[PDB]
């Protein structure tokens, strides 16, 4: 006898068929994937083919209404961890994949789940009625696993590895409300999804692995475990990422931000080199030239140095200029050490070296006001400390070092200084907006300031944070590879961030912005107990990313 | 007609073989380990090798997330009591070892465990994912015991007792969260691990009692009963230890402090 | 009929046996790799198993003496491009591999090659007599391919994927001098090596690919094509790598340099953050405090801030201090913008902001002399331009920004400024020395200066170069992973850099230094027409790396 309480790795449990799984589909799938040649990696006795391996886990609570979606997977060789390795030596794939669900509940629970394979060409999200497709209904009291097969319903004769085309989507939604007849704090059970290729899965043509690599067919390898723990910086301050900042209002970052199409709207390369502009006018107030505040300005659009955009010099911060006058230190400003140099010889001036506040403004000879649009604006520098003399040369130049620190009027730290009310954006960049319970996030790094240059993380004076839209390895890999055929609009590419106590998901839209499903919470995420990052793949944007840190 | 509520000492229960237990692994283990001469203590009627005996017990809480480690042991003679007695009497070993798990829960509980055998070269830590190995899943409502045999996967021809080298590792983690539908104070059950050598386990060379090398006898002898309620002094002062106090936040002492690997970072020899 | 002039991909040509290939070795290899379980990926009709795929090409000239080694490969699943993909899902391997040699010569050429499989435990290099092993002799006039099989002569019962153990080595040396009876400029032919697994090759256990990944078993993925073209920086100046600098005398870099054991001797993390030191004495000369040169110094060894070494603060340059006085700009110095800050509050001073030269010196109150050893020395800063007033506080602090520029006394550029005569090294770091015709190389990046801040690559004023020991992605990946069981001492890990016109090899020693076989040439390599980088694996250090750029 074999009890139902212990299940083998190769045991499928009960096999739950659906009208979408037909012999005609299987025979047509084999017969027309044969245009790739003989099927490859089809040995039935291989260990990667015979066992089920983990794909996901999800929670089913009593508050989950009938029709609400709990699980959604897209047909891919990236669901299985071993067909994802084998796809790096083959140029195509076809066939189906089995999905084994193990429900972890007792015999006292009620409520049921429903499972349908959704054909390609149908939008996946809320309002998709899973119970009016051909479906299967699973109890909460299932002891044995329930494996359903996802066939290859494809309009192409095989899926190329780079662009697969249209694929089905397996949806597990709530059929009936899960009930606990006991009543109390214990109202949730868990369902584990595992996966294994079907008997008619195959790869079709071989190809050299030095062709389109793992970094060009999916953005799974961009956001790996050392990137988010201690190695990757951000794309604004070049500082070690120590957290995530949820932005419930939404923001819009243009500079050093790459979308999933391999394009940018900014004026900066994916690197932190210096800001060097030629022929911008420099000036200094009054008639006396001792301890004066050096000023520099140049119209946006006349920076003919960058092969990416003519708006601003490379590495210029996309922050509005905060106005200040006299010997008063401004609040929340990008300042960076630099100098004024004569354009005719390239020689920097001896005495005009200071920490210059860099930003975007509107009227440089008159009243200095901040701005966000680059149109009709100008890139404006002005030193925050005293400079002896000052170059009043009109064709003069400005050279400012790459990384920047925070201007703070006192020793005490302030909030994260690129707030969305002052981030400079060209006309045309799309904005990150909260979709469902998923709010956009930034990537906080500890950035020191001009009030305490000894201030580190956890300083008793107060810790200072600067935020970026993307990690630098993420936007470095996004500029080098194109992932248009990896995510439709209205979809996220989700990773899982396992922590020491909890676990929580982030997702990347086609715009390039990252999202965590935290709702309206503004509390910074610690990112210190982060142990593991793994990808799970394309998911709907209107499906809440999980977030529990307790 | 045993009802399943009472299990014999020799009864394994349901045998769950993942993908590592193969016949020709056993054949390539038995034939190869003849480099230690004739195999010793191989009599499959002796009671020390036919019965399951206690090794460890562990607690499965409702707060243990999926993927959390509950019970991991490297392949060793030390996972069995009588094999640990005989391992000081011999200088090499080979073969597998069965692990019988008995879950102490009623039929009202829910949640699953996952057990895999990890191959010898793999590093075991935070990044190891155990459900993406060939595994077996065990329910919290298991009445009969479940036996998972870890075979002897090895690149060496046998395992020296002082330097076994690369061994496989049985890893038992949480597959699904443990659920009590009542809630309340009861939030943890217990699993007892019994152990018994496999059909192909053996020793080879004899050697003098108490004489091996690396993997020095685990430091169970440096901390005994009197240390706390008798002799035994401190590092800064020479007084009896009257209590322990927990510091929230941590500390750092590097004067008379020696680490697992014998080394000090500082002055002041321990006297 | 099948002519010998056209050969199939699956055609082995003639099969050249050796006494090292025996039936007892094959049967023992199968019978004892069976302890891993059933053999995996052993389907004989698979396309990756049946075809030969490219491994290497090498040149055989008339100047190559009898006994000189032309080709050397180590037994590995990294020789084949498809067993290298399959090794990411398996925990072990065993069995042999075939090597197919196609000699490209006419029937007018003379001379012969010899081929032996060398057993493990034997040193590979010059003076290894291949003609006194069991061997096979191949003409220069061979029309059909010659395939010889490399058996698995192993003392382990299988090779684990991470550490394989002792493996054989296939050596192709010269048997007889290649002769052209014609005489002239055409004195070289080419031999192509291809590879295919043997019938008894296998993988033994499956494992999850999220285990020890491709970046931990071999350093092949560290030096990839975007790293050396336009993305990677260097570990000294954080600038885009535009070339390689051959150093025929040898050098020794300690700071921000990681070896293959995952260890460093430097005082810097693999990142370019700022230099922040507490309690170093600051001073300024004379009694007047206008336009004075600010000075700062602190003894090396009293920087209690770094969790890696107490020698110097994190990010401090390993360059000797070049002395200067008065209003004279020094030559070839690390200068970086910074300030002096009061240690009791962390507040930077308003007026002491300048471009400070940073270096290592010996006597700070007396005569400032340069130094290379860190022992008995001190980290010394001194501004290169005028600073109003100056903090004379003994417990004061220094904060200098991360990246540095060159100090140049005129507008004109100079040689690459971290010359090996001034690179600061702790006592204990090993030095890069020329082995054979292979000389160590650095990684030149265009670093701008204080004489022309508009100076870029190819400037009519003159281009300025700063060199580092390693690329930043290479030393970032070397700190995260340990490759002790990837290269024995006396070996290089070679990559191939294919250019538009030529192709040339670099190799990485266990010390962490890179080598190119260029002899005594000091000419900088252009690295602009670099199109492809691929790895080839462990090779002897006393075997000249190829170099032809024409």
UniProtKB/Swiss-Prot annotation, chains A, C:
It is found in: Virion; Host cytoplasm. Capsid protein VP60 self assembles to form an icosahedral capsid with a T=3 symmetry, about 35 nm in diameter, and consisting of 180 capsid proteins. A smaller form of capsid with a diameter of 23 nm might be capsid proteins assembled as icosahedron with T=1 symmetry. The capsid encapsulate VP2 proteins and genomic or subgenomic RNA. Attaches virion to target cells by binding histo-blood group antigens, inducing endocytosis of the viral particle. Acidification of the endosome induces conformational change of capsid protein thereby injecting virus genomic RNA into host cytoplasm. Homomultimer. Interacts with host type II histo-blood group structures antigens at the surface of target cells. This is Capsid protein VP60. It comes from Rabbit hemorrhagic disease virus (strain AST89) (Ra/LV/RHDV/AST89/1989/SP).
């Amino acid at each position: 006898s074999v009890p139902g309480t212990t299940t083998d790795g190769m045991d499928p449990g009960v096999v739950a068929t659906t009208s979408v799984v037909t012999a005609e589909n299987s025979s047509a799938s084999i017969a027309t994937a044969g245009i790739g040649g003989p099927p490859q990696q089809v040995d039935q006795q291989e260990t990667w083919r015979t066992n089920f391996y983990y794909n996901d886990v999800f929670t089913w609570s009593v508050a989950d209404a009938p029709g609400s979606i709990l699980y959604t997977v897209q047909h891919s060789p990236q669901n299985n961890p071993f067909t994802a390795v084998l796809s790096q030596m083959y140029a195509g794939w076809a066939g189906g994949m089995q999905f084994r669900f193990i429900v972890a509940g007792s015999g006292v629970f009620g409520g049921r789940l429903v499972a349908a394979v959704i054909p390609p060409g149908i939008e996946i999200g809320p309002g998709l009625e899973v119970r009016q497709f051909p479906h299967v209904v699973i109890d909460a009291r299932s002891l044995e696993p329930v494996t359903i097969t996802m066939p290859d319903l494809r309009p192409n004769m095989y899926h190329p590895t780079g662009d697969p085309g249209l694929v089905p989507t397996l949806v597990l939604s709530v059929y009936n409300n899960l009930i606990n007849p006991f009543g109390g704090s214990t109202s949730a059970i868990q369902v584990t999804v595992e996966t294994r290729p079907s008997e008619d899965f195959e790869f079709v043509m071989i190809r050299a692995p030095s062709s389109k690599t793992v970094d060009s067919i999916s953005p799974a390898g961009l956001l790996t475990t050392p990137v988010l723990t201690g190695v990757g910086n951000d794309n604004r301050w070049n500082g070690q990422i120590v957290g995530l900042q949820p932005v419930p209002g939404g923001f819009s970052t243009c500079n050093r931000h790459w979308n999933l199409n391999g394009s940018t709207y900014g004026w900066s390369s994916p690197r932190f080199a210096d800001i060097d502009h030629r022929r911008g006018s420099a000036s200094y107030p009054g008639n006396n030239a001792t301890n004066v505040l050096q000023f520099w300005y140049a119209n946006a659009g006349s920076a003919i140095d960058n092969p990416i955009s003519q708006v601003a010099p490379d590495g210029f911060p996309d922050m509005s200029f905060v106005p200040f006058n006299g010997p008063g230190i401004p609040a929340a400003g990008w300042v960076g050490f630099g100098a004024i140099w004569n354009s005719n010889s390239g020689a920097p001036n001896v005495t005009t070296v200071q920490a210059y506040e860099l930003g975007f403004a509107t009227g440089a000879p008159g009243n200095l006001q901040p701005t966000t649009n680059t149109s009709g604006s100008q890139t404006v520098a002005k030193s925050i400390y005293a400079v002896v003399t000052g170059t009043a040369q009109n064709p003069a130049g400005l050279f400012v070092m790459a990384s920047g620190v925070i201007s703070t009027p006192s020793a005490n730290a302030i909030t994260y200084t690129p707030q969305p009310d002052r981030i400079v954006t060209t006309p045309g960049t799309p904005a990150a907006a909260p979709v469902g319970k998923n709010t956009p996030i930034m990537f906080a790094s500890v950035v020191r300031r001009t009030g305490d240059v000894n201030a580190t993380a956890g300083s008793a004076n107060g810790t200072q944070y600067g935020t970026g839209s993307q990690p630098l390895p993420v936007t470095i890999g996004l500029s080098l590879n194109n992932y248009s055929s990896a995510l439709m609009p209205g979809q996220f590419f989700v990773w899982q961030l396992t922590f020491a106590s909890g676990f929580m998901e982030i997702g990347l839209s086609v715009d390039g912005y990252f999202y965590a499903g935290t709702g309206a919470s503004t509390t910074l995420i610690d990112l210190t107990e982060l142990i593991d990052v793994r990808p799970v793949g394309p998911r709907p944007s209107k499906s809440t990313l999980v977030f529990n840190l307790g």
